[PDB]
Design a protein around this ligand. Sequence first.
Ligand SMILES: O=C(O)[C@@H]1CCC[C@H]1c1ccc2cnccc2c1
Length: 164
Amino acid sequence: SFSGYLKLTDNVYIKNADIVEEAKKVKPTVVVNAANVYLKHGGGVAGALNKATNNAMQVESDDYIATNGPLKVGGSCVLSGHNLAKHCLHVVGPNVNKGEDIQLLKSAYENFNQHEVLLAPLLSAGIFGADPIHSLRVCVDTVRTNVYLAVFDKNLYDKLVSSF
Ligand SMILES: O=C(O)[C@@H]1CCC[C@H]1c1ccc2cnccc2c1
């Protein structure tokens, strides 16, 4: 039921949209969160998704970390999607503003291949400090399953499409 997306490749689609409003409308099987290793959803996409769940995402995430410990950079976990989706795939891309290695971005996108279809943001972009044009290139060259990318900033969406 995804609508208004521009087809970039056989399996990658993109739209200028707020991933929160997109999730509420579609209720996809999987929404991807741009997580950190501690699942502390303070800002960016994670802060927005968590606020839309009335903090239920953060309560579930704190129980997951108390049991399992932190994720790896490049890793992921599957938790509830709450009121937004059936599942939330929390994926940790490298944070360049914390000095993490951009080379781990391909490993982060490989987590998407475990799900037939996903609603997602660009990993390591925004407050994680990587170049979004690079993040879209790694996405297209790594993900083989059907990915619907929601880009919040209109100016960035136009730059990503015009330079693809
Ligand atoms: O698409 C973007 O412009 C950026 C790229 C990196 C993460 C994206 C982002 C960031 C904050 C968001 C806040 N609310 C809703 C969706 C949000 C999406």
